[PDB]
RNA sequence: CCAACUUCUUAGAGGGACAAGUGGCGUUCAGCCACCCGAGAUUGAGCAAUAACAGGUCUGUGAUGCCCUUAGAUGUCCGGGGCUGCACGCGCGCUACACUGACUGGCUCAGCGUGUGCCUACCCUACGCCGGCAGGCGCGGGUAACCCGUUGAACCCCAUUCGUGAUGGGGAUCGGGGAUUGCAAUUAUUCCCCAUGAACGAGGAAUUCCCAGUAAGUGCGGGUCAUAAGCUUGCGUUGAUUAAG
């Protein structure tokens, strides 16, 4: 049931490409970044986009993801 | 006299509000009626009719305003004129769903084809800034047995609670020569104003991302003392 | 006629005297909170009263 | 005068009575009166239930309509000449305000 | 509120964490972590609350999950 | 109906002093509400106003259970011919307001 | 001011948890499984697409087409009967077949919610004094986080009596008396008392519901209601087993 939807996996690639330098590998800081930088309508997908953006922040610093 | 409980006050003006909305629909059907808005005061209360064609509720110096505050008076029991109508032209004339539901009510009574008339109105909502709409005509078309036409053109959601205010539904009836026709128009409204013409509070299936700024001065430093 | 006994059976207590508020049924009505509407009638204005759902 | 007044406010919707709450809060405190806060009496939810069908055919469904009325309540002390500018600083169709009689 | 055994777990819960909160505030936390050691490893649910609740009835059977008997003929 | 003459004047004079009246479709009530004093039940108000429609002088709709009317302008020039009133004595249909 | 406060009571804004942390599995891709910390590492439900059905509803609808009827009217009202009639078959459901219980007396702890009417006239009732009991009487609150109401609910807890018995388990059947609702209680409206004490000893082939505050036992409040719950709808409690040619 953990598998993440499209519009969360769509909205993460538009963020982390465009704000790769304004981030980190911390979920609770990137939570606050994602609300600042784009209008999220509600809290649940706020920190659920932020989770997948952090899921790439420990990741695209290693290997060739679409980065 | 003696006074009743709050739980029977809120249903009393809840059921007051429904009744005159029923009759004024029965009375101002031909006008692009589209609802009411009521203000209860301990003074002259103020009902307003949101009619598009505001002429046809007026006569010579408000004929069908003054008695349509008097039929409301001597039914519900107001004092002598603590209630008044005001006719009011609504903005986005064919974008509120009830209005053209009343228009194509009378446009089917002139004897048109259903496909000619609906392509009239389907092109009329979707030209009127509507993000999406779809119109259903049900009833006794060609044959003994009755069938159903629908004219989806545009985007429209169906579930969640935000099919409450991005959309409105209007269901009306058209008495034709045999039986009764069924009209069922639903229209999805644009987010655009955060304000007047549409709803606020954007639809949660998309993220409105913004650009980064001009990224000025990354280079070797500078300073000013002022 | 002959008004001594015409409507004489006492329309008082009992569901032959309670009626539907909208268009004159007497079955399945809702006397809760003094609404006086039959079950079929209540659903159409449902929002028009203000009873929204869970959502 | 000098009195003891209580103003009440209740509605179906909550967001409108949240603002009418704070507006009379600031509307006494701009005239620097003394207020006791908005007391939170519990929300009255009535849950009338119907069988959702016009006939007897179905698979025994039911729908649960409900209306939650919120109610809040505030004392003041001031004389009741200014019950008009307590009345007429907000119009607001969906709220129902009352003021308790001022014999103290 | 409660019942007969819904209450005695409620006072067991209560006076377990009562002195733990007196020992965050009027003795050190070394001894508080000491008394939290004995309480947690022995059936932990004393001073941490039990979360679950009633899980309401639905509209087709006699409770939360039970249903009425269906009759095919 | 059977038209008692002093009662029909009382229902016409209320229908002449303004252009509204709000009879309700429950004919087994002894006392018509807007009149309530000159001893009229609801059948008298029904079947007099029903006589008017077939001539066309009044014009109706129907609410939930209330049975409203409106006064066509031919009705006004008939009501003066029943109540002996000149073409200065008018209803409230024309204007009293601002 | 002849006290300080919000911890429970209550809402409101906001915070909170995402499968991020840790290892293992896996094209090191979506992810999966183990623990770390945590109140929470799947809370329950509502709205639910296209395209359908000769599904149901003309006996809700001043929604309606057609057809029939229209005064020795299927319109309308009053009076009595009727849907409740019983050689029989089937379907949801309630009690029981006991000793893990039935009695008797102690003893005790809930939540949701509703309450006097524009018309419509009958509401929840605490207290007091009469009665073995239903109930009757005056006197008072309550249009309600104000009164009923700290809602002294049941199961259960404990002390006695009862002992494997068709038994004091079980209460169908039925006679007599007694009270309230009402225009009227008979074909018993309900309630109370005394008496009567039938099958029934765990249920054939078959079949239904259900996986954690779950089934199940257990009461309670709504709806309908003048008098009314063996129903339904909610709440609480005790709580487990496993085509470009
Ligand atoms: Mg109907
Ligand atoms: Mg035995």
UniProtKB/Swiss-Prot annotation, chain A:
Compartments (UniProt record): Cytoplasm; Nucleus, Nucleolus
Signal peptide as annotated in the record: none
N6-succinyllysine sites (modified residues): 18
The organism's place on the tree of life at top rank: Eukaryota
Disease as annotated in the protein's UniProt record: Diamond-Blackfan anemia 4: A form of Diamond-Blackfan anemia, a congenital non-regenerative hypoplastic anemia that usually presents early in infancy. Diamond-Blackfan anemia is characterized by a moderate to severe macrocytic anemia, erythroblastopenia, and an increased risk of developing leukemia. 30 to 40% of Diamond-Blackfan anemia patients present with short stature and congenital anomalies, the most frequent being craniofacial (Pierre-Robin syndrome and cleft palate), thumb and urogenital anomalies.
Family note: Belongs to the eukaryotic ribosomal protein eS17 family.
UniProt function note: Component of the small ribosomal subunit. The ribosome is a large ribonucleoprotein complex responsible for the synthesis of proteins in the cell. Part of the small subunit (SSU) processome, first precursor of the small eukaryotic ribosomal subunit. During the assembly of the SSU processome in the nucleolus, many ribosome biogenesis factors, an RNA chaperone and ribosomal proteins associate with the nascent pre-rRNA and work in concert to generate RNA folding, modifications, rearrangements and cleavage as well as targeted degradation of pre-ribosomal RNA by the RNA exosome.
Protein name per Swiss-Prot or TrEMBL: Small ribosomal subunit protein eS17
Record organism: Homo sapiens (Human)
UniProtKB/Swiss-Prot annotation, chain B:
Region forming the signal peptide: none
Membrane topology: Peripheral membrane protein
E.C. code: 4.2.99.18
Modified residues (Phosphothreonine): 41, 69, 219-220
One annotated Gene Ontology cellular component of this protein: ruffle membrane
Outcome when changing residue 208 to A: Reduced phosphorylation by IKKB
CDD domains associated with the record: KH-II_40S_S3
Residue stretches spanning the membrane: none
Residues modified to Phosphoserine: 5, 34, 103, 208, 223
Main location: cytoplasm
Residue positions, PTM N6-acetyllysine: 61
Effect of residue 69 to A: No effect on phosphorylation by PRKCD. Abolishes phosphorylation by PKB
Effect in UniProt of substituting residue 34 to A: No effect on phosphorylation by PRKCD
Residues recorded as bearing N-acetylalanine in the entry: 1
Outcome when changing residue 17 to R: No effect on sumoylation. Abolishes sumoylation
Regulation: Endonuclease activity is inhibited by MgCl2 on apurinic/apyrimidinic DNA but not on UV-irradiated DNA.
Residues of the KH type-2 domain: 20-91
GO biological process per UniProt: apoptotic process; base-excision repair; cell division; cellular response to hydrogen peroxide; cellular response to reactive oxygen species; cellular response to tumor necrosis factor; chromosome segregation; cytoplasmic translation
Cross-link (Glycyl lysine isopeptide (Lys-Gly) (interchain with G-Cter in ubiquitin)), chain numbering: 89, 201, 213
Record's comment on post-translational modification: Methylation by PRMT1 is required for import into the nucleolus and for ribosome assembly.
Annotated keywords: Acetylation, Apoptosis, Cell cycle, Cell division, Cytoplasm, Cytoskeleton, DNA damage, DNA repair, DNA-binding, Isopeptide bond, Lyase, Membrane, Methylation, Mitochondrion, Mitochondrion inner membrane, Mitosis, Nucleus, Phosphoprotein, Ribonucleoprotein, Ribosomal protein, RNA-binding, Transcription, Transcription regulation, Translation regulation, Ubl conjugation
Residue numbers of Asymmetric dimethylarginine PTMs: 63-64, 66
Cell compartments where the protein resides: Cytoplasm; Nucleus; Nucleus, Nucleolus; Mitochondrion inner membrane
Name of the protein in question: Small ribosomal subunit protein uS3
Name of the encoding gene: RPS3
UniProtKB/Swiss-Prot annotation, chain C:
Residue numbers bearing the N6-acetyllysine modification: 47
One GO term (biological process): cytoplasmic translation
Cofactor annotation: Zn(2+)
Residue positions where Omega-N-methylarginine is found in the record: 11
GO molecular function: structural constituent of ribosome; zinc ion binding
Keyword set, alphabetical order: Acetylation, Cytoplasm, Diamond-Blackfan anemia, Disease variant, Endoplasmic reticulum, Metal-binding, Methylation, Phosphoprotein, Ribonucleoprotein, Ribosomal protein, Zinc
GO cellular component assignments: cytoplasm; cytoplasmic side of rough endoplasmic reticulum membrane; cytosol; cytosolic small ribosomal subunit; extracellular exosome; focal adhesion; nucleoplasm; ribosome
Note on how the cofactor is bound: Binds 1 zinc ion per subunit.
Chain positions with Phosphoserine modification: 8
Residues at which Zn(2+) binds: 20, 23, 38, 41
Listed Gene3D superfamilies: 30s Ribosomal Protein S14, Chain N
Subunit structure of this chain's protein: Component of the 40S small ribosomal subunit.
Clinical disorder: Diamond-Blackfan anemia 13: A form of Diamond-Blackfan anemia, a congenital non-regenerative hypoplastic anemia that usually presents early in infancy. Diamond-Blackfan anemia is characterized by a moderate to severe macrocytic anemia, erythroblastopenia, and an increased risk of malignancy. 30 to 40% of Diamond-Blackfan anemia patients present with short stature and congenital anomalies, the most frequent being craniofacial (Pierre-Robin syndrome and cleft palate), thumb and urogenital anomalies.
Name the UniProt record assigns to this protein: Small ribosomal subunit protein uS14
Originating species: Homo sapiens
Gene from which this protein is expressed: RPS29
Curated annotation (Swiss-Prot), chain D:
Modification Phosphoserine, positions: 78
Biological process (GO), any one: translation
Modified residues annotated as N6-acetyllysine in this record: 19, 60
A GO molecular-function descriptor: structural constituent of ribosome
Gene3D superfamilies: Ribosomal protein S10 domain (3.30.70.600)
Any one GO CC term of the record: cytoplasm
Annotated compartments: Cytoplasm
Highest taxon, organism lineage: Eukaryota
UniProt modification remark: Polyubiquitinated by ZNF598 via 'Lys-63'-linked ubiquitin chains when a ribosome has stalled, initiating the ribosome quality control (RQC) pathway to degrade the potentially detrimental aberrant nascent polypeptide. Deubiquitinated by OTUD3 and USP21, antagonizing ZNF598 activity. Ufmylated by UFL1.
Function statement: Component of the small ribosomal subunit. The ribosome is a large ribonucleoprotein complex responsible for the synthesis of proteins in the cell.
Subunit field text: Component of the 40S small ribosomal subunit.
Name of the protein in question: Small ribosomal subunit protein uS10
